[PDB]
Amino acid sequence: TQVKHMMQVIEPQFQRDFISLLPKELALYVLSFLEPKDLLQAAQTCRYWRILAEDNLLWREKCKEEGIDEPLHIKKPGFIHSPWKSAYIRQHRIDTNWRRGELKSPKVLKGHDDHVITCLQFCGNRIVSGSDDNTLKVWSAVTGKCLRTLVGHTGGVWSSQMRDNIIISGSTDRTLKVWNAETGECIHTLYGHTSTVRCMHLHEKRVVSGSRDATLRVWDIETGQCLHVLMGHVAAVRCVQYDGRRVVSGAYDFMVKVWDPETETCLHTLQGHTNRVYSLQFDGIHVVSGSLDTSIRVWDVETGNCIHTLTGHQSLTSGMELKDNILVSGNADSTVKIWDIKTGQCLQTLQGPNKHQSAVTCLQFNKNFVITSSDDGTVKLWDLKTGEFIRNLVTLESGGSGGVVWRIRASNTKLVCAVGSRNGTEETKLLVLDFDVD
Amino acid sequence: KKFELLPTPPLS
Amino acid sequence: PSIKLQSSDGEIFEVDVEIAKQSVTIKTMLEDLGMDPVPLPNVNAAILKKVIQWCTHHKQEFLKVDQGTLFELILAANYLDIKGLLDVTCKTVANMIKGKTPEEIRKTFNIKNDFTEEEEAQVRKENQW
């Protein structure tokens, strides 16, 4: 369709081989059985194969394979480059750039001096850092300059959410605040909690908040009013999930509760953890809970039955990510585990000779890599598929004498790291690492 | 059991 | 009952309605167009015999022929719509390419590097791994 152009315009020398002599459509069919590594090699045999191995609908299919789903445009005997091939190649380069590309020194965004970064958001090109310094800061992931400082809270910030230009914050001052991320202006102060606002989860137009007062509150992000109050927990509420339909909450009362928010009704009390529930994941079908009991329970939301209780960690499960029934759990036992929550299999433990030396503070993952951060001052890249250590993405000099990495967000091309120390050996700051190509 | 190395707001 | 085909060079093959149904071209000629001897002007008696052998085995080793017989079996499977045979022969050709560098691909098929010294550098960098 678009390869006939190149044929009758870059007239290639006659070829005496098998695929140059097939009807174009049949050569394309044959070349469609190859993997990109081999299509990429074939393109280098001769001018005829190069033109044929750049068919758009050949690569639209390979990109759909690796979940690309979006072409790349870049506005001498010339060439009509495929956007789906540029899209595929670009991704493989970003991948190899994370895995083994030289680490260009990061942008350092200094702020929240001598305090803790307690929450991190990363949204397009904006970063939001929250702190016990009472403030939040909005940054540009591109320039590294501080754009705004969200001042108004009388106590320390301890949770946050970000949709798009709306920032939600939680503080020890018992209040949540709705913010405009461009203007820096606070547009609502949400009153109702009687204790510190510990967690929050935003789904579209509503944020659910958990407090040290043992309650949850559902709020309208636009009208700034408080729609519901979920009462039933007996100790502080530490984690919360909200999919638009149920609220799932975990607390220091050893319990996980499932709610219907509209009716304010507790549908299920999930019982089994023998210590505080500290982290939660919910995909509308399964709720996944991690506790100081060293266990991670997988529950069925619609019945409240416990499907799996996943054992093996030895300490608090600090963070978890759930995606397509793959669970990644980080722990204070200095260990990251990849679980298959369909079968309960523990697919991998990340514990090399290059294992973390302190607790895991944060993690992120995608189809290729797990990214982990720790008290040891490091952020490590791991191969999801093999469980193997790849490399240290960050290695604070102060890691062993006080320097810690509190939190990471990753995009497809950048890594953001919240870094600091309780003892002054690390000035507190964000690090931005760029893994893009051209 | 290396927890409480993770931050958490002070008590009131 | 059983139908008759006519290759391009003139030979007549007797085959069962069951075996020939596997090609949509022959099926259309028999059921919708009423081709008494089914005329096959793009398949010779040799390749026709080989395609019937596959169409009996089904409703590798067979495809260990010389390059060229594979070419004519790919063209026959496109003409007589046998998606099965078409898949196995095109897959068999691809397998001749997997896991080879540009210069050892140019060997299995006789290909010539028509690339200029600079062009080759461009195509080396553009398809890096």
Tab-separated table of N, CA, C and O in Angstrom, chain A residues 44-108:
chain	number	residue	atom	x	y	z
A	44	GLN	N	18.526	-5.531	7.026
A	44	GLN	CA	19.890	-5.173	6.672
A	44	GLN	C	20.483	-6.055	5.579
A	44	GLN	O	21.668	-5.910	5.266
A	45	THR	N	19.693	-6.951	4.982
A	45	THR	CA	20.227	-7.834	3.948
A	45	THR	C	20.435	-7.088	2.637
A	45	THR	O	21.519	-7.145	2.049
A	46	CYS	N	19.411	-6.387	2.161
A	46	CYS	CA	19.509	-5.671	0.897
A	46	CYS	C	18.446	-4.586	0.868
A	46	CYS	O	17.557	-4.541	1.718
A	47	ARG	N	18.550	-3.709	-0.132
A	47	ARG	CA	17.599	-2.608	-0.250
A	47	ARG	C	16.175	-3.116	-0.447
A	47	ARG	O	15.216	-2.477	0.003
A	48	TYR	N	16.001	-4.298	-1.025
A	48	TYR	CA	14.621	-4.771	-1.297
A	48	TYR	C	13.980	-5.178	0.029
A	48	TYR	O	12.836	-4.777	0.293
A	49	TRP	N	14.701	-5.957	0.835
A	49	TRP	CA	14.150	-6.454	2.121
A	49	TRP	C	13.897	-5.282	3.066
A	49	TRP	O	12.898	-5.322	3.767
A	50	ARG	N	14.785	-4.291	3.089
A	50	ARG	CA	14.595	-3.093	3.943
A	50	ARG	C	13.235	-2.471	3.650
A	50	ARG	O	12.505	-2.181	4.606
A	51	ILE	N	12.916	-2.276	2.376
A	51	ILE	CA	11.639	-1.629	1.976
A	51	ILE	C	10.476	-2.511	2.431
A	51	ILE	O	9.480	-1.968	2.930
A	52	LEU	N	10.626	-3.826	2.328
A	52	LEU	CA	9.513	-4.753	2.646
A	52	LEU	C	9.336	-4.861	4.154
A	52	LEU	O	8.190	-4.985	4.596
A	53	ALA	N	10.432	-4.797	4.909
A	53	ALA	CA	10.375	-4.944	6.381
A	53	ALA	C	10.022	-3.613	7.036
A	53	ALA	O	10.253	-3.488	8.238
A	54	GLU	N	9.498	-2.662	6.269
A	54	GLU	CA	9.040	-1.385	6.851
A	54	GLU	C	7.561	-1.213	6.537
A	54	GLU	O	7.109	-0.063	6.487
A	55	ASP	N	6.843	-2.319	6.339
A	55	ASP	CA	5.409	-2.188	6.120
A	55	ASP	C	4.708	-1.798	7.415
A	55	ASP	O	4.915	-2.427	8.457
A	56	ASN	N	3.865	-0.763	7.349
A	56	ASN	CA	3.203	-0.278	8.556
A	56	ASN	C	2.414	-1.387	9.238
A	56	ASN	O	2.560	-1.614	10.441
A	57	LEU	N	1.564	-2.090	8.488
A	57	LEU	CA	0.697	-3.079	9.121
A	57	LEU	C	1.467	-4.300	9.610
A	57	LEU	O	0.881	-5.162	10.274
A	58	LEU	N	2.758	-4.397	9.301
A	58	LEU	CA	3.595	-5.428	9.898
A	58	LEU	C	3.960	-5.063	11.329
A	58	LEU	O	4.008	-5.937	12.204
A	59	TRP	N	4.209	-3.774	11.575
A	59	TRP	CA	4.639	-3.278	12.871
A	59	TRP	C	3.474	-2.853	13.756
A	59	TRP	O	3.546	-3.035	14.976
A	60	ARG	N	2.401	-2.297	13.178
A	60	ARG	CA	1.193	-2.077	13.971
A	60	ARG	C	0.846	-3.331	14.756
A	60	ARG	O	0.353	-3.246	15.887
A	61	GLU	N	1.145	-4.502	14.191
A	61	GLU	CA	0.827	-5.755	14.855
A	61	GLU	C	1.863	-6.110	15.908
A	61	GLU	O	1.502	-6.615	16.973
A	62	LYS	N	3.149	-5.850	15.641
A	62	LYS	CA	4.179	-6.107	16.653
A	62	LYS	C	4.069	-5.131	17.822
A	62	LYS	O	4.327	-5.499	18.974
A	63	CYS	N	3.707	-3.877	17.543
A	63	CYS	CA	3.496	-2.906	18.612
A	63	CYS	C	2.283	-3.273	19.453
A	63	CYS	O	2.334	-3.221	20.686
A	64	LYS	N	1.175	-3.630	18.804
A	64	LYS	CA	0.038	-4.157	19.545
A	64	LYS	C	0.447	-5.352	20.399
A	64	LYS	O	-0.130	-5.575	21.468
A	65	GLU	N	1.446	-6.122	19.955
A	65	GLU	CA	1.944	-7.244	20.749
A	65	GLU	C	2.538	-6.764	22.064
A	65	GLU	O	2.113	-7.185	23.147
A	66	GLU	N	3.543	-5.895	21.986
A	66	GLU	CA	4.239	-5.389	23.160
A	66	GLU	C	3.502	-4.214	23.846
A	66	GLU	O	4.140	-3.429	24.565
A	67	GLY	N	2.192	-4.079	23.640
A	67	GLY	CA	1.421	-3.021	24.264
A	67	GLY	C	1.931	-1.613	24.019
A	67	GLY	O	2.065	-0.825	24.960
A	68	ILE	N	2.207	-1.269	22.763
A	68	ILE	CA	2.639	0.083	22.436
A	68	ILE	C	1.409	0.906	22.066
A	68	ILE	O	1.101	1.920	22.709
A	69	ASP	N	0.690	0.471	21.034
A	69	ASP	CA	-0.629	1.026	20.703
A	69	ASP	C	-0.586	2.522	20.420
A	69	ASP	O	-1.542	3.228	20.731
A	70	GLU	N	0.501	3.024	19.836
A	70	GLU	CA	0.595	4.447	19.526
A	70	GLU	C	1.817	4.719	18.654
A	70	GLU	O	2.955	4.578	19.123
A	71	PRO	N	1.672	5.215	17.390
A	71	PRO	CA	2.826	5.386	16.507
A	71	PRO	C	3.679	6.619	16.827
A	71	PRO	O	3.239	7.471	17.558
A	72	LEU	N	4.887	6.671	16.275
A	72	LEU	CA	5.793	7.810	16.544
A	72	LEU	C	6.130	8.490	15.221
A	72	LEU	O	6.600	7.808	14.311
A	73	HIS	N	5.895	9.795	15.139
A	73	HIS	CA	6.201	10.550	13.902
A	73	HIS	C	7.386	11.477	14.165
A	73	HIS	O	7.564	11.882	15.320
A	74	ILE	N	8.171	11.777	13.130
A	74	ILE	CA	9.373	12.646	13.297
A	74	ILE	C	9.388	13.748	12.232
A	74	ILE	O	10.265	13.664	11.354
A	75	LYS	N	8.457	14.711	12.279
A	75	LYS	CA	8.436	15.876	11.372
A	75	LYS	C	9.743	16.684	11.440
A	75	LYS	O	10.735	16.364	10.772
A	76	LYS	N	19.605	12.380	-1.299
A	76	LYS	CA	19.698	11.035	-0.682
A	76	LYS	C	18.531	10.195	-1.177
A	76	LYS	O	17.403	10.706	-1.134
A	77	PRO	N	18.742	8.968	-1.700
A	77	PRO	CA	17.621	8.100	-2.038
A	77	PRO	C	16.865	8.047	-0.707
A	77	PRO	O	17.429	7.558	0.249
A	78	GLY	N	15.627	8.547	-0.668
A	78	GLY	CA	14.888	8.663	0.605
A	78	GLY	C	14.284	7.378	1.125
A	78	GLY	O	14.650	6.312	0.626
A	79	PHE	N	13.388	7.485	2.105
A	79	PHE	CA	12.783	6.320	2.731
A	79	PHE	C	11.499	6.752	3.425
A	79	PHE	O	11.469	7.803	4.072
A	80	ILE	N	10.442	5.954	3.278
A	80	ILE	CA	9.199	6.171	4.015
A	80	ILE	C	9.263	5.305	5.266
A	80	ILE	O	8.977	4.107	5.227
A	81	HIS	N	9.634	5.917	6.384
A	81	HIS	CA	9.762	5.170	7.624
A	81	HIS	C	8.392	4.845	8.201
A	81	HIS	O	7.456	5.648	8.128
A	82	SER	N	8.279	3.662	8.768
A	82	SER	CA	7.056	3.278	9.445
A	82	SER	C	6.992	3.951	10.813
A	82	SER	O	7.978	3.916	11.557
A	83	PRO	N	5.875	4.597	11.164
A	83	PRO	CA	5.739	5.121	12.533
A	83	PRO	C	5.607	4.026	13.579
A	83	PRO	O	6.025	4.220	14.727
A	84	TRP	N	5.022	2.885	13.219
A	84	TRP	CA	4.958	1.772	14.145
A	84	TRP	C	6.313	1.115	14.332
A	84	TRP	O	6.557	0.516	15.378
A	85	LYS	N	7.211	1.230	13.361
A	85	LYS	CA	8.561	0.738	13.588
A	85	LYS	C	9.356	1.716	14.442
A	85	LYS	O	10.076	1.303	15.354
A	86	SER	N	9.243	3.011	14.171
A	86	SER	CA	9.884	3.984	15.048
A	86	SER	C	9.342	3.868	16.472
A	86	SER	O	10.104	3.923	17.446
A	87	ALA	N	8.025	3.680	16.611
A	87	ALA	CA	7.442	3.449	17.927
A	87	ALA	C	8.028	2.206	18.598
A	87	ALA	O	8.339	2.239	19.794
A	88	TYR	N	8.177	1.097	17.859
A	88	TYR	CA	8.739	-0.113	18.461
A	88	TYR	C	10.199	0.083	18.844
A	88	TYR	O	10.614	-0.256	19.956
A	89	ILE	N	11.003	0.601	17.925
A	89	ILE	CA	12.427	0.771	18.209
A	89	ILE	C	12.630	1.706	19.396
A	89	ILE	O	13.430	1.423	20.290
A	90	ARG	N	11.910	2.836	19.422
A	90	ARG	CA	12.046	3.781	20.531
A	90	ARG	C	11.881	3.092	21.880
A	90	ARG	O	12.665	3.328	22.805
A	91	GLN	N	10.866	2.230	22.005
A	91	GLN	CA	10.604	1.535	23.260
A	91	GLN	C	11.742	0.588	23.625
A	91	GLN	O	12.197	0.573	24.772
A	92	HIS	N	12.195	-0.234	22.675
A	92	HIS	CA	13.308	-1.137	22.955
A	92	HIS	C	14.531	-0.360	23.432
A	92	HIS	O	15.280	-0.842	24.288
A	93	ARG	N	14.720	0.862	22.932
A	93	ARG	CA	15.847	1.687	23.360
A	93	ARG	C	15.656	2.197	24.784
A	93	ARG	O	16.587	2.152	25.599
A	94	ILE	N	14.464	2.718	25.092
A	94	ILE	CA	14.146	3.079	26.471
A	94	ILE	C	14.361	1.884	27.403
A	94	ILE	O	14.969	2.009	28.470
A	95	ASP	N	13.872	0.703	27.010
A	95	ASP	CA	14.082	-0.498	27.811
A	95	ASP	C	15.566	-0.750	28.048
A	95	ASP	O	16.001	-0.932	29.189
A	96	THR	N	16.365	-0.801	26.973
A	96	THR	CA	17.792	-1.074	27.155
A	96	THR	C	18.484	0.091	27.847
A	96	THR	O	19.528	-0.093	28.484
A	97	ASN	N	17.894	1.273	27.767
A	97	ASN	CA	18.453	2.439	28.430
A	97	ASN	C	18.305	2.345	29.949
A	97	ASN	O	19.224	2.711	30.693
A	98	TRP	N	17.137	1.895	30.425
A	98	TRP	CA	16.974	1.564	31.837
A	98	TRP	C	17.941	0.464	32.245
A	98	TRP	O	18.614	0.554	33.278
A	99	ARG	N	17.996	-0.604	31.448
A	99	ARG	CA	18.673	-1.825	31.869
A	99	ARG	C	20.185	-1.629	31.934
A	99	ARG	O	20.815	-1.974	32.944
A	100	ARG	N	20.799	-1.068	30.864
A	100	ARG	CA	22.259	-0.979	30.822
A	100	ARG	C	22.806	0.358	30.341
A	100	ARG	O	24.026	0.503	30.258
A	101	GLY	N	21.976	1.348	30.042
A	101	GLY	CA	22.504	2.605	29.543
A	101	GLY	C	23.176	3.428	30.633
A	101	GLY	O	22.673	3.562	31.747
A	102	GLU	N	24.316	4.014	30.282
A	102	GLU	CA	25.043	4.885	31.198
A	102	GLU	C	24.101	5.862	31.899
A	102	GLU	O	23.201	6.436	31.286
A	103	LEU	N	24.329	6.054	33.192
A	103	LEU	CA	23.436	6.832	34.046
A	103	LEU	C	23.862	8.290	34.014
A	103	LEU	O	24.799	8.690	34.710
A	104	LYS	N	23.171	9.098	33.222
A	104	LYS	CA	23.482	10.518	33.234
A	104	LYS	C	23.054	11.114	34.568
A	104	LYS	O	21.995	10.775	35.104
A	105	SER	N	23.905	11.966	35.129
A	105	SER	CA	23.667	12.449	36.483
A	105	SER	C	22.284	13.097	36.580
A	105	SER	O	21.820	13.733	35.619
A	106	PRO	N	21.595	12.942	37.705
A	106	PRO	CA	20.187	13.326	37.768
A	106	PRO	C	20.029	14.805	38.064
A	106	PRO	O	20.923	15.456	38.604
A	107	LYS	N	18.861	15.324	37.695
A	107	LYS	CA	18.428	16.627	38.175
A	107	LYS	C	18.170	16.546	39.676
A	107	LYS	O	17.489	15.623	40.139
A	108	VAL	N	18.703	17.488	40.457
A	108	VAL	CA	18.431	17.498	41.893
A	108	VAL	C	17.504	18.668	42.207
A	108	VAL	O	17.802	19.817	41.869
